[PDB]
Amino acid sequence: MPRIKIIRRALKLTQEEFSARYHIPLGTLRDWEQGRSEPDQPARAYLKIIAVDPEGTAAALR
Template identity: 35%
Template sequence: MFEDLVQSLKEAKAITKGEIQPSRRFTVEAPDVRTLREKTGLSQAEFAGLMRVSIKTLQNWEQHRRKPTGPAAALLHVVAKAPDVVIQSLHIRQ
């Protein structure tokens, strides 16, 4: 198993240096944030709290000045699929 880990690290280094291409790449596009927030019935302050971002960041997303990326985009997909579960799990009350 150690040899597999060493090989993985060597591959990661080569990918970082641009010497080889990654075997797969994942991109997560965020849904329309304003529409999603309005669907949940949460205010901007409440939704920003749910997402653990500032209200200004949320406003930038809603006005398409910025796009949520990484974990925020993934969490928005979960909110889109199961808003009640996310709100309940993160202890946000509607």
């Protein structure tokens, strides 16, 4: 399974919640989770930061 889907489920967030908390448009989140497309390089780097620090990342965006 795609890394974003692993990370989101491990944080116990719905797609809607993860989309709003981390500023990833919901359709593209769904594309990534379904294998319809893949995150580009800055997005992969961003997903790694979310994984390392989900709370710090979420707080920085608020």
